[PDB]
Design a protein around this ligand. Structure first.
Ligand SMILES: [Zn+2]
Length: 258
């Protein structure tokens, strides 16, 4: 596969190799705050990251992933809309070439500068690869980024990016605390959907936080210096690595807050 975000292999082409791209439960979506309904049945959401063990950061040619040890319940997501326990495996971002675009989800059609995805898999399925084959296999916590003040908790990520500039490079990345990427409020919207990159599997309970985090223009500018290409290949800046909103179809977006 040669999917990407370029001029000839971007999101509008993915359906040829991944027909589920035109499926019933695709992500991202636009969140219409005028039709999402408060759901008093959501249970409290629970982010337990005190024992998280980051290991490594990888440029995979599509984004970079900060990877965690997921062989024990060290960093888990529970509550909210979820049944059971979901273990953190990685986080990554999607971002724009311009501050006015970059997010995958939109809010009343507003695009944020970027979007953080903390990816968790349902421990009842034993491993990530089995989990993605199940409709309730993953829980992805999505957090919007706007450009303003710097996010101090992001700076250690920013400062390692020079070491993983190109596709296939990785670097040790231990002792990173993902709590430093959360906003104050855990109010959220939730709906059933998909991975936003191929294979686009419809295995995700999405939990999108209402409150964005702020990052500085200097922080996003360093993301925009990453490369989609490998070392030695023509330079292609890693920007605009977002899929646009997909049809909601027979889904409802539910709000945790009034
Ligand atoms: Zn993502």
């Amino acid at each position: 596969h040669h999917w990407g975000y370029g001029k000839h292999n971007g999101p509008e082409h993915w359906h040829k190799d991944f027909p589920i791209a035109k499926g019933e439960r695709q992500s991202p979506v636009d969140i219409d705050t005028h039709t999402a309904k408060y759901d008093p049945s959501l249970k409290p959401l629970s982010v337990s990251y005190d024992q998280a063990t980051s290991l490594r950061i990888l440029n995979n040619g599509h984004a970079f992933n900060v990877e965690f040890d997921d062989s024990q319940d060290k960093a888990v997501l529970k509550g909210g809309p979820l049944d059971g326990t979901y273990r953190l495996i990685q986080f990554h971002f999607h971002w724009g070439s311009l501050d006015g675009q970059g997010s995958e989800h939109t809010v009343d059609k507003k695009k944020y500068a970027a979007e953080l995805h903390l990816v968790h898999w349902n421990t009842k399925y034993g491993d990530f690869g089995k989990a993605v084959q199940q409709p309730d296999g993953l829980a992805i916590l999505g957090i919007f980024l706007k450009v303003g003040s710097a996010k101090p908790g992001l700076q250690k990520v920013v400062d390692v990016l020079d070491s993983i500039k190109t596709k296939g490079k990785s670097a040790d990345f231990t002792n990173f605390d993902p709590r430093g990427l959360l906003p104050e409020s855990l109010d959220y919207w939730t709906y059933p959907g998909s991975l936003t990159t191929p294979p686009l599997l419809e295995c995700v309970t999405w939990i999108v936080l209402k409150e964005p985090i702020s990052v500085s223009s200097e922080q996003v500018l360093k993301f925009r210096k990453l490369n989609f290409n490998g070392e030695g290949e023509p330079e292609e800046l890693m920007v605009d690595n977002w899929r646009p909103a997909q049809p909601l179809k027979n889904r409802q977006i539910k709000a945790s807050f009034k």
